[PDB]
């Protein structure tokens, strides 16, 4: 977790669960990381038990998530002075987007009773729009790099563990040692025994 406290300040480092600094003490089963970019005014719309207009039609974080969001501001290849039409969002969706679900659609979404399935006009629009990721705009129009940490517990043996520090050698002086979870007290001397590699 030493590479998780740099790379620009995190706009929203406050968590809704286990502390980020306590993740080194506890080992976790699996981690889910999602990579997307949102606008500066869409940072506040994501919350446990709270949603906005853009957040309801997009990925939503429910009350029970076992994790939180860490987002920061960085503008190296995220903001374009001209056009930025690659990154898009959903603002006209069929229903509320349930968590842990995703959907892709490049086809037009109707707004009335006429089925727009190949033709459009005044009463039919397109469900996607592009962000105004421009440096000449305001703070709330600036792009933000957003990642959400999701954890699943009590479903698999734990293998994604935190970092464990190490100390220096000691000789001929009894200490309170700890070797891979084996605790004890005693001297540390050179051994004439022979083991097997397992």
């Amino acid at each position, epitope marked *: 977790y030493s590479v998780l406290y740099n790379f620009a300040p995190f706009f929203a480092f406050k968590c809704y669960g286990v502390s980020p600094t306590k993740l080194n003490d506890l080992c976790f089963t699996n981690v889910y990381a999602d990579s997307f970019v949102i606008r500066g005014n869409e940072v506040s719309q994501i919350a446990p038990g709270q949603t906005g207009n853009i957040a309801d039609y997009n990925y939503k974080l429910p009350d029970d998530f076992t994790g939180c969001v860490i987002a920061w501001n960085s503008n190296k290849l995220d903001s374009k*002075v001209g*056009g930025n039409y690659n990154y898009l969002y959903r603002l006209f969706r069929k229903s509320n987007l349930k968590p842990f679900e995703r959907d892709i659609s490049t086809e037009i979404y109707q707004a009335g009773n006429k089925p727009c399935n*190949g033709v459009a006009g005044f009463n039919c629009y397109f469900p996607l729009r*592009s962000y105004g990721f421009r440096p000449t705009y305001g703070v709330g129009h600036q792009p933000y790099r957003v990642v959400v940490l999701s954890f699943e517990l009590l479903h698999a043996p734990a293998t994604v563990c935190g970092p464990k520090k190490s100390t220096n050698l000691v000789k001929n002086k009894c200490v309170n040692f700890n070797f891979n979870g084996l605790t004890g007290t005693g001297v540390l001397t050179e051994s004439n025994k022979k083991f097997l590699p397992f």
Partner: antibody, heavy 126, light 109 residues
Framework: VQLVQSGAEVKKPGASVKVSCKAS????????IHWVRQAPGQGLEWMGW????????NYAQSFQGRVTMTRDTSITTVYMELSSLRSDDTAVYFC????????????????????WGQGALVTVSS | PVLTQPPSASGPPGQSVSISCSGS????????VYWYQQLPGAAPKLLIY???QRPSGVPERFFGSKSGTSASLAISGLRSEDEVDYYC???????????FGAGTKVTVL
């Protein structure tokens, strides 16, 4: 901005030519450069775009290996190759500068062709 | 998916007329239709984008509109200085490229 062209000669079929459009005068990492050919006796054709910061392109179902598009960011100049010139290749490969990044397929719907400047003229003949 | 555009347009001056550029299924309607122009012996320019707003630098004579499969270009008044070669441009998801028709040539009657 300097959207001038590089001169090219007439070549018989069976060889390749070098066509270059100047991309200077503006920053290379945010504006896309498009190439549209105007051929008499038929409609215009558009084959594909580039991302002018890395290797990213998509080819339409009309040209597969005839046209190769490259990019250089050190001197901000782009070179294209036209091979096996024929009746279909008889067109003026215009240079179109537009806003947008366009590393995906859905970007092209919201994007319009901003400025056309100094299309290179290519004559196909033995 | 090839755009159908008439080769010659019979537009009489002094009265409005609308020309149609129709495509096919999943070619017009899923993506917008764009209107452009080019002078013979000169670089092309932009006429109408998105069929919603008229851009700056172009007089507000050509109307950007689309109704169903057929794309209708509406004009208000004809001038001898505005006989430029109009063109029909559209984006196709089934081709991943810009599709162009034959092109309209406008001659004063």
């Amino acid at each position: 901005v300097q959207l001038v062209q590089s001169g090219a000669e007439v070549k018989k079929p069976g060889a390749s030519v070098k066509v270059s459009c100047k991309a200077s005068g503006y920053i290379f990492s945010d504006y896309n450069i498009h190439w549209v050919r105007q051929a008499p006796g038929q409609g215009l054709e558009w084959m594909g775009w580039i991302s002018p910061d890395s290797d990213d392109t998509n080819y339409a179902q009309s040209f597969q290996g005839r046209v190769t598009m490259t990019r250089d960011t050190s001197i901000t100049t782009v070179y294209m190759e036209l091979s096996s010139l024929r009746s279909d290749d008889t067109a003026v490969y215009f240079c179109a500068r537009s806003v947008g990044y366009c590393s995906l397929n859905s970007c092209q719907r919201w994007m319009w062709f901003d400025t056309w400047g100094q299309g290179a003229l290519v004559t196909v003949s033995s | 998916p090839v755009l159908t555009q008439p080769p010659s347009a019979s537009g009489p001056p002094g009265q409005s007329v609308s020309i149609s550029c129709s495509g096919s299924r999943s070619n017009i309607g899923t993506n917008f239709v764009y209107w452009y122009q080019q002078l013979p012996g000169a670089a092309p320019k932009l006429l109408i984008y998105k069929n919603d707003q008229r851009p700056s630098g172009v007089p507000e004579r050509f109307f950007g509109s689309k109704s169903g499969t057929s794309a209708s270009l509406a004009i208000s008044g004809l001038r001898s200085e505005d006989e430029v070669d109009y063109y029909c441009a559209a984006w196709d998801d089934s081709l991943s490229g810009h599709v162009f028709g034959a092109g309209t040539k406008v001659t004063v009657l």
